[PDB]
Every structure is written in structure tokens, then in C-alpha cells.
Amino acid sequence: MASMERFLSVYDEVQAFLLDQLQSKYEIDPNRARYLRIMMDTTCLGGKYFRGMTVVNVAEGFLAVTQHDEATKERILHDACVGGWMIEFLQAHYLVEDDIMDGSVMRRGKPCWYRFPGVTTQCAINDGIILKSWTQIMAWHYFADRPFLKDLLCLFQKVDYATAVGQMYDVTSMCDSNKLDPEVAQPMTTDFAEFTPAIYKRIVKYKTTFYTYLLPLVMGLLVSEAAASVEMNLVERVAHLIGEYFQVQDDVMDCFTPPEQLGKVGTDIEDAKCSWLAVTFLGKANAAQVAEFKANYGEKDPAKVAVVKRLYSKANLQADFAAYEAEVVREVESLIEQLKVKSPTFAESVAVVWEKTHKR
Amino acid sequence: MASMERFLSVYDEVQAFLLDQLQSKYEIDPNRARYLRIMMDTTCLGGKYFRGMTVVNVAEGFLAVTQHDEATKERILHDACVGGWMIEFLQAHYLVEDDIMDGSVMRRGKPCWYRFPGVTTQCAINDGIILKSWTQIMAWHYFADRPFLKDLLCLFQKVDYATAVGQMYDVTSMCDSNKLDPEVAQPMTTDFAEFTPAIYKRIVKYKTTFYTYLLPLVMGLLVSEAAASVEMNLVERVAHLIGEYFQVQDDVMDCFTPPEQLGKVGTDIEDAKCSWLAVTFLGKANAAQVAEFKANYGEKDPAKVAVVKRLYSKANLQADFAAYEAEVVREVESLIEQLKVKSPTFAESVAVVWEKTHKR
Numbered sequence: 001m002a003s004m005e006r007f008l009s010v011y012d013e014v015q016a017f018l019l020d021q022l023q024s025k026y027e028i029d030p031n032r033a034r035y036l037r038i039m040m041d042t043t044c045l046g047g048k049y050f051r052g053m054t055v056v057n058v059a060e061g062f063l064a065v066t067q068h069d070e071a072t073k074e075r076i077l078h079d080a081c082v083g084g085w086m087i088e089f090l091q092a093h094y095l096v097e098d099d100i101m102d103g104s105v106m107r108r109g110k111p112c113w114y115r116f117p118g119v120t121t122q123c124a125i126n127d128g129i130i131l132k133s134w135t136q137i138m139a140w141h142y143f144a145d146r147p148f149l150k151d152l153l154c155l156f157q158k159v160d161y162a163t164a165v166g167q168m169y170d171v172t173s174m175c176d177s178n179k180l181d182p183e184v185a186q187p188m189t190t191d192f193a194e195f196t197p198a199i200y201k202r203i204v205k206y207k208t209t210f211y212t213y214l215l216p217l218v219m220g221l222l223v224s225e226a227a228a229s230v231e232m233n234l235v236e237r238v239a240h241l242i243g244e245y246f247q248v249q250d251d252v253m254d255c256f257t258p259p260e261q262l263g264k265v266g267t268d269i270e271d272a273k274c275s276w277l278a279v280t281f282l283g284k285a286n287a288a289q290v291a292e293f294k295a296n297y298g299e300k301d302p303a304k305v306a307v308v309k310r311l312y313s314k315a316n317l318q319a320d321f322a323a324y325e326a327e328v329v330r331e332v333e334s335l336i337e338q339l340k341v342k343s344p345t346f347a348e349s350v351a352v353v354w355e356k357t358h359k360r
Numbered sequence: 361m362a363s364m365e366r367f368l369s370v371y372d373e374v375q376a377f378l379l380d381q382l383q384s385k386y387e388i389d390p391n392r393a394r395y396l397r398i399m400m401d402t403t404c405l406g407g408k409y410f411r412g413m414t415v416v417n418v419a420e421g422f423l424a425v426t427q428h429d430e431a432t433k434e435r436i437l438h439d440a441c442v443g444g445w446m447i448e449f450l451q452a453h454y455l456v457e458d459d460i461m462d463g464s465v466m467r468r469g470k471p472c473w474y475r476f477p478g479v480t481t482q483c484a485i486n487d488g489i490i491l492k493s494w495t496q497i498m499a500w501h502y503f504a505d506r507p508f509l510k511d512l513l514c515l516f517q518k519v520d521y522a523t524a525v526g527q528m529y530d531v532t533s534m535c536d537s538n539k540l541d542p543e544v545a546q547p548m549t550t551d552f553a554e555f556t557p558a559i560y561k562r563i564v565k566y567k568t569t570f571y572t573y574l575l576p577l578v579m580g581l582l583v584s585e586a587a588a589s590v591e592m593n594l595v596e597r598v599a600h601l602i603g604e605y606f607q608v609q610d611d612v613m614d615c616f617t618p619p620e621q622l623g624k625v626g627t628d629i630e631d632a633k634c635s636w637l638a639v640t641f642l643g644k645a646n647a648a649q650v651a652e653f654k655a656n657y658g659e660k661d662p663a664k665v666a667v668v669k670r671l672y673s674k675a676n677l678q679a680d681f682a683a684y685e686a687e688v689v690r691e692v693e694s695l696i697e698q699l700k701v702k703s704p705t706f707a708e709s710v711a712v713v714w715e716k717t718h719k720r
């Protein structure tokens with residue numbers, strides 16, 4: 001059976017499970033069941049399933065080199081699909097809540113969930129809560145007797161926590177740290193002293209890399225009972241490296257990818273985000289360029305946004321991007337080599353993960 | 361050592377643990393640590409700790425009748441405090457997110473967290489996320505080797521899910537179920553056909569009783585290794601019964617308790633909530649009273665709100681309240697009796713839980 005169709009079939013199975021349990025155990029009525037169904041579909045479906053499919057792909061790699069009964073191969077592939085949907089639903093949770101936090105308008109060429117007429121923020125915050133709660137219901141039901149349940153829940157928990165801490169880093173990235181104070185309305189930085197590579201790397205490491213790369217790889221190892229085919233510190237380092245590159249790519253696209261293709265009007269400049277473009281620009285700008293950046297960044301005025309995009313264009317950040325990209329290529333290839341010592345198979349799964357990211 | 365001081369000491373210990381781990385493992389800076397510290401204190405402290413203290417009280421009851429080494433008594437009381445703070449932090453999560461959802465202004469005589477000048481909704485949604493994530497970090501660290509970890513996490517998970525489903529019931533209680541549709545803006549009911557006792561009871565059962573009464577009682581049983589001193593179906597029934605009564609009390613107070621004493625300007629009438637007052641009123645009203653209710657409910661206009669409160673006053677709902685209260689007294693006393701068959705001690709813990717609720 002082809003992987004994607006297995007994975008989509010499992011979505012249907014998990015959805016039916018969840019909705020049927022709401023009826024039998026939580027006293028739900030048909031209409032609220034239908035609302036939840038629609039919420040689940042709208043918020044969890046229509047992306048590329050990179051995250052969830054990675055769990056499946058890692059598991060398929062191990063199956064090719066490991067002796068098992070056919071029934072066991074099916075059980076492992078089913079568990080990899082359920083685990084992948086746990087990650088897709090965790091992403092859905094964070095995208096619903098982030099879109100509300102950031103006053104976002106669109107996502108994947110459709111309105112953000114909270115903007116749907118019959119949703120509203122009042123419902124949507126809680127819908128996002130339910131999305132993450134479903135990840136736990138899936139795990140407790142499908143992995144009840146599994147030897148990896150403990151480790152999978154502990155890992156998922158750490159990754160969710162890292163992700164929330166990364167959200168905090170992100171939403172506070174345009175403030176001066178010494179001024180953070182619940183009692184005082186937060187001004188935007190005027191110095192931009194905290195727009196540095198290390199501070200950027202902290203934001204992206206926590207906001208995105210743990211859930212997008214670390215969790216899919218380690219979940220495919222867990223459902224395969226293969227965590228001893230790796231050096232976990234290597235897996236962490238390669239996840240964090242690829243994941244950073246993914247985010248840099250997303251930062252450049254927010255500024256330069258046409259909206260119809262982005263699925264999004266990008267507003268990182270207006271929102272004063274600590275983007276790779278802004279940190280790279282401040283790393284090579286002269287005094288007058290720095291001052292012109294400071295006069296225009298973090299403002300909704302389209303003319304000021306056009307001045308920042310011009311400053312980026314004239315600073316030939318494409319060349320810095322190519323240089324960054326070449327260094328990451330170098331480093332990812334090195335880690336892949338190190339991962340072949342313990343597991344050619346796992347190494348190859350990471351190579352595929354890299355190819356997929358590198359070729360967006 | 362007195363229970364409350366043990367419990368507050370453990371708060372300090374858990375806070376320090378959590379903040380120190382952010383520093384050592386999550387790369388946090390001192391200023392963001394201070395923001396989180398302040399968030400934790402503001403959102404988790406200053407209530408009566410009924411929930412968390414119930415875990416401690418159930419555990420203390422068992423200790424009085426069970427042989428243990430002193431070191432074991434201390435370990436059980438510490439675990440009961442940590443478990444109680446897991447529930448207090450789960451409540452904090454839901455109160456932060458609910459206040460945002462409901463556009464609330466105050467709570468416990470202070471502004472809602474999101475309204476603090478240096479918070480904002482953008483931060484506060486995520487702060488609420490972190491509050492619940494902390495409950496998992498506490499459990500994984502403090503209960504790592506404990507025989508009850510599995511059962512405590514499974515239970516907590518179910519209770520959190522029930523609570524989110526109850527939030528859905530609550531926020532959608534003034535809509536007609538057959539009209540729920542993400543694509544269509546939701547009108548308020550005009551018939552009030554779904555303002556019934558059974559529909560009310562479903563809202564309150566899920567929104568409040570699982571986290572407020574079921575979880576503190578069952579957590580005190582789990583940390584005591586005492587789940588075989590009870591019939592779980594009795595514990596469920598008594599939790600749901602007392603918890604309903606608690607909420608009816610909160611509904612009457614939203615309408616009739618002066619704001620300075622409530623900690624809150626109550627807005628259930630304007631918000632068109634399915635309250636005990638509204639369902640009781642519609643259960644005894646004549647045709648003209650029903651029509652006058654329909655013209656005035658669910659409207660911000662203070663004159664219309666004054667007309668609903670008058671309709672409630674003239675309908676002598678105090679008498680229905682007394683009758684309800686007498687029935688619950690009857691039923692709670694009956695369940696307490698049944699619980700004495702297996703455990704006088706646990707029975708007495710539930711009696712205390714009832715006394716505390718009955719005497720608010």
C-alpha cells in the first residue's frame with residue numbers, strides 16, 4: 001500500500017474514532033459533532049503532510065532492513081500513521097492559536113479558522129485547545145499497550161513545551177528584553193541590538209525545529225523500536241540545523257514570494273519580526289542604511305514597507321542566502337555521514353528530509 | 361506541618377524548578393524568566409486553592425489510617441501537593457483562555473491577564489498554553505518513578521479533554537444546535553428550546569465538574585495508592601452532583617452578588633448564557649413572562665438586563681433554589697453513605713468537600 005493513501009486512510013479512521021467517542025462518552029449531539037468534524041478537516045488538512053509523512057518514511061526505512069511478520073509490518077505502519085497525525089494535529093493547534101495571536105488573515109489561501117463566520121475567536125481558541133487534546137486521545141487509545149508509549153508521550157510533551165517557549169521568543173522578539181514587564185505596555189525596540197544571529201537562532205530553534213524536524217524523526221524511531229540505531233545528540237543537531245534552514249527559507253518567502261503563491265500576504269516587516277532578512281541586513285549595513293531601516297521597520301504604512309524591501313534588495317541578501325545555504329549543505333552532509341556509522345537507513349531518511357527541504 | 365503551608369511551599373519549589381529548567385535547558389534569559397514568573401503568580405495564585413487542597417486532604421485522610429514510614433508519609437504529602445498544583449495550573453490555563461474568549465474584564469478583583477498592559481492577547485493565549493504545558497512538566501519530573509504515573513496522566517488527559525468539550529458546550533449554549541455551521545454567522549436562539557435542565561446539566565458536567573471535583577478526588581486516591589478503597593462509579597456520581605450544585609451557585613451569584621464581592625461585574629444575561637436562573641425561570645414562566653424574557657435576554661442594554669433581573673425576582677427563584685438545594689443535600693448524603701461501605705475515610709473527605717461547597 002502506498003504511504004500517502006495509508007496515511008489518509010488513517011486520518012479517516014482516527015476522525016471516526018474521535019467523533020464516535022464524543023457520542024458514546026461525552027454526550028455530544030450530531031450538530032456539534034459535525035462542527036468538530038469540519039474544524040478538524042479545515043485545520044488539519046490541505047498541507048503537504050511533511051511532518052506526519054516523515055514518521056511514516058522513517059518507519060518504512062527500518063521495515064526494509066528488519067525481520068518481522070506481515071502483521072507486525074502493518075502494525076508498525078499504522079502506528080507511524082497515528083504518530084504522524086499526532087504531529088499534524090499538534091501543528092494545527094499551534095497554527096490556529098498563532099493565527100489568532102498574530103491577527104492573521106489567511107493561511108493556505110483560505111481564511112484563518114477564527115475568521116470563518118460561524119467560528120469567531122471565542123470558539124476558535126477552544127477549538128485549538130481541542131486539537132491538541134486529540135493528540136493525547138489518539139496516543140492513549142492506539143498505543144495503550146505499546147512499549148514505546150511512555151517515551152513517545154514524554155518526548156511529545158517536551159516538544160510541545162519547547163514550541164510554546166519558542167512562540168514566546170517569537171512574539172517578544174521586537175521588544176527590548178530589559179523592558180519586558182506585564183505591568184507596562186511594550187515599546188518596539190529602537191536600537192535593534194537584539195537582532196543578532198544567536199538570538200534569531202534561539203527563536204527558530206524552539207518555535208519550529210522541535211516540532212517540524214526533531215519530533216517526526218524521533219517518533220519514526222520510537223514506533224520502530226529503533227532508538228538504539230542512533231546517537232540522539234546527532235539527531236538533535238541535524239534536526240536543529242535543517243529546521244533553521246527551513247525557517248530562513250520561510251522568512252525570505254514572507255518578503256519576496258507573491259501572495260497567491262505564499263497562500264498569505266506576508267507582514268513580517270510591519271510586525272517587526274526578527275527575520276533572517278532583518279538580522280542579515282543589519283549585519284552588513286552601513287550607518288546610513290541602519291538609520292533608514294530604523295525609520296521604516298515595524299510600520300503598517302506601505303510606503304515604509306516598500307523602503308525596507310528596497311533596502312533588502314540593494315543589500316544583495318541573495319548572496320548572503322547562497323552563502324548560508326552552502327554552509328548548511330556542508331554541515332547537513334557531514335551529520336548524515338556521521339549518522340551512517342550507526343544506521344545507513346536512518347541516515348538515508350535524513351537525506352530525504354534534507355532533499356525535501358532543500359528543494360522547496 | 362500544616363497543609364496549606366506545605367502546599368504553598370511546594371508552589372515555590374515547583375516554580376523554582378520550572379524557571380531553573382527554562383534557564384538550563386531552554387536557553388531562557390533572565391527577563392523572560394521574570395515575565396513567566398510573574399505570569400505564573402498572577403494566574404495561579406490568589407484563589408482559595410480548593411482544588412489543589414482537596415488532593416492534599418484526601419491524602420491526609422488515608423495517611424491517618426495506613427501504616428507507613430515517616431519518609432513515605434512525606435513523599436505522599438509532597439506528591440499530593442504537586443498533583444494539587446497540576447490541577448490549580450490546569451484551572452489557570454482555562455481561566456486565562458476563557459477570559460480571552462469571553463472578553464472578560466476582571467477576575468478576583470484584578471484585570472484579566474490578557475488586559476495587563478505588557479501582556480496583550482497575543483502573549484496571553486500563549487501564556488495560557490504554557491500554563492497547561494507546565495502541568496505535564498511537573499508530572500514527568502516529580503512522578504517519574506511512581507507507580508501511579510500512567511494512571512495519573514491518563515486521568516488528567518481525560519479530564520482536560522472533558523473540560524474543553526464543556527467549554528464548547530458553554531460557548532454554543534445560546535445558539536440553536538441545528539444552525540451550528542462554521543460557514544454561517546451564528547444567530548442567538550429566539551425560541552430558547554434548548555434552555556432545558558438536561559442541556560444545562562450537560563454543559564456544567566463537562567465544563568466544570570470533571571476538573572473541579574472529579575480530578576482532585578481521584579488524584580488524592582492515586583497518589584495514595586487507594587483507588588481500591590472506592591467504587592469509581594460512586595466517585596463519579598458524587599463529583600458530578602456536587603459540581604453541578606457549585607455551578608448553580610455560581611450562576612445565581614453572577615446575577616445577584618454585588619460586583620465588589622463577586623470579584624467580577626456579572627454579564628451572563630447580556631451574554632445570553634444558559635444559566636440555572638434562565639432555565640428555572642423558563643420552566644415556570646407563563647406565556648407573557650416567556651415573551652418578556654425573549655424581548656430582553658442577551659442584550660447589552662442595561663434597561664433590558666434590569667427587566668430580566670426583575671423577571672427573575674418576581675418568579676421567586678429563591679424557592680426553586682431551596683428546593684434544588686434540598687434535593688442535592690439528600691442525594692449527596694446518600695452517596696456519602698454508599699462510599700462508607702468501602703471507605704469511611706474517603707467518605708469523610710467527600711463530606712468535607714460537600715461542607716465546603718455548601719457553605720460558600
Ligand SMILES: C[C@H](O)CNC(=O)Nc1ccccc1
Nearest residue numbers: 048050246262263356357360
Ligand atoms: C506553503 C508551505 O510552506 C508549504 N509546505 C511546505 O513547504 N512544507 C514542507 C516541505 C518540505 C519540507 C518541510 C516542510
Ligand SMILES: C[C@H](O)CNC(=O)Nc1ccccc1
Nearest residue numbers: 408410606622623716717720
Ligand atoms: C469567588 C470564587 O468563587 C471563590 N472560590 C471558591 O468559592 N472556591 C470554592 C470553595 C469551596 C468549594 C468549591 C470552590
Ligand SMILES: [Zn+2]
Nearest residue numbers: 098101102170
Ligand atoms: Zn506568530
Ligand SMILES: [Zn+2]
Nearest residue numbers: 250251254268
Ligand atoms: Zn513566516
Ligand SMILES: [Zn+2]
Nearest residue numbers: 458461462530
Ligand atoms: Zn466562558
Ligand SMILES: [Zn+2]
Nearest residue numbers: 610611614628
Ligand atoms: Zn459564572
